[PDB]
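A brief tutorial aside. Many learners find it easier to grasp structure tokens once they have seen a single protein encoded end to end. The record that follows does exactly this for Bromodomain-containing protein 1. Read the sequence first, then the structure, and try to relate runs of similar tokens to stretches of the chain.
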Amino acid sequence: SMEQVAMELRLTELTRLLRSVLDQLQDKDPARIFAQPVSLKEVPDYLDHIKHPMDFATMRKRLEAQGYKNLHEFEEDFDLIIDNCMKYNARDTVFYRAAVRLRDQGGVVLRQARREVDSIG
């Protein structure tokens, strides 16, 4: 149908905008702490602690399959990255601190993203 195509074009354009958001958030992680999944070879107990691991490469795979239907879904995954880290790592660690700084800096980007998603529809 033509309606199905129009819906698909909307999803494609959301995917465009989420890719730009993802790039901007990942620049706020210059140490690349959140770039890849926590290695289960190197942290063998991780899944005992963290039930839904997340990282920027995993988000990018979902994004490129157009697997985010709305900004809420994308933010859910970003918040997992931060929240998983702040639970597994203690306050005094470079990991925890990196997450706090990513959260704080990403907030600004996500605030305007929400306006753009609503604005463009």
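Self-check: Residues 1-121 form a domain with the Histone Acetyltransferase; Chain A fold (CATH 1.20.920.10). If you spotted this yourself, you are ready for the next section.
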